[PDB]
Point group: C2
């Protein structure tokens, strides 16, 4: 309890000129004393964070200059860390449900915990993704360096992978209603794309789909009973 005030007071003082660590100390202490659910340190030019209040369920720290996070409290449900300079993340609490860390410099994600439902991590430097947890509903990984993709869990609804280097797409679960796959290196599509719901959104423009893929898809989608989705794509 006073462990935090000692830690925070010393972190108060150890800052470069622009960091608004003076406001940060105030928000940290109040957050501890009133046992608040959310800690909001966004837009404070912070280059580091100290140890965090243990009871919080929302950590909002977007638009700072963080290179690393401290250990994450075990009750966190939502973490918004987008627009920092994060190079990695610490271990994620088992309670984590929503993680936004887009627009950082993260080269690898840590193990993804079982309750994660929304992962938004575009504009990083990911070459690989860890295995996806069973409740994942939304996955946004556009604008990274992804060469390959782990298999999809069977509740995934939204998938955004534009502007990567994916060569092969794993099978798409019937739960998927939004598949944004532009500007990759796909030459073929998984058969399961055609088995999605009729109103599903599918965009594979900007991929070098082979001639056989194109003729295959043209024969099926123009069949008189075709019930699959509309597929957007491009040539040239």
């Amino acid at each position: 309890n006073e462990f935090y005030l000692k830690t925070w007071s010393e972190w108060e003082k150890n800052g470069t000129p622009g960091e608004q660590r003076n406001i940060a100390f105030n928000r940290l202490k109040i957050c501890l004393q009133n046992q608040e659910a959310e800690l909001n340190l966004s837009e404070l030019d912070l280059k580091t964070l100290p140890d965090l209040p243990p009871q919080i369920t929302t950590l909002e720290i977007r638009k700072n200059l963080l290179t690393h996070l401290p250990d994450l409290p075990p009750m966190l449900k939502v973490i918004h860390a987008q627009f920092n300079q994060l190079e990695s993340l610490p271990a994620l609490p088992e309670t984590l449900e929503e993680l936004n860390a887009g627009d950082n410099k993260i080269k690898e994600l840590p193990f993804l915990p079982e309750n994660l439902t929304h992962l938004r991590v575009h504009n990083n430097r990911l070459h690989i993704l860890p295995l996806l947890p069973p409740e994942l509903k939304l996955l946004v990984v556009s604008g990274n360096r992804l060469d390959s993709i782990p298999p999809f869990p069977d509740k995934l609804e939204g998938l955004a992978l534009a502007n990567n280097f994916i060569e092969q797409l794993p099978e798409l679960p019937f739960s998927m209603n939004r598949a944004v796959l532009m500007n990759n290196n796909l030459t073929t599509l998984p058969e399961s794309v055609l088995r999605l719901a009729q109103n599903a959104f599918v965009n594979v423009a900007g991929n070098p789909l082979s001639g056989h893929t194109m003729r295959t898809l043209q024969q099926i989608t123009t069949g008189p009973d075709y019930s699959g989705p509309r597929i957007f794509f491009s040539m040239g």
Copy 2:
């Protein structure tokens, strides 16, 4: 010239298994012998390029695995090098008019030559831009690490700098009709935004514009003779 056929022939032999350097050697051979304007080595899994045929005016090499480019021939007008692993670019030929190098790892650009009209470099790692040349017409630098922007040349028509860390935007020239400025760190807007043409597109959603900026902009834009453009933005 037998100088190129030897060099290309020995570059052909020196590849790892997946690189399709045999198809590339043939395209090089055809390009040299028929004196073609365009050399197209895109989508061949290439990790390096050899010396290039000197007469080409279009270099098409997107979607390979290149880390460095070779010296560029002196009549190049168009270079499409997006989706590689570029670390940097070589010195740019004086004739260069269009450069696309998005989705690489480029940390800084070289000197930009005087005839460049189109620069598309989104999804790289730029912290700074070089000074912009006087004919620049289109500038796309979305998805980088930009903290600042050099002054804008006065024929610039399209500007896309979404998803960077820019805190102050330089003045916008009257020629600009498309200003895509979302998800940065602006708290205010330059005066010159209000002097753009009435049909210009301006999008600053996702910036933490101050309350004073918002109330000022609301007073001006709702006056009965407001002559400027529509501005899109966001709150929350």
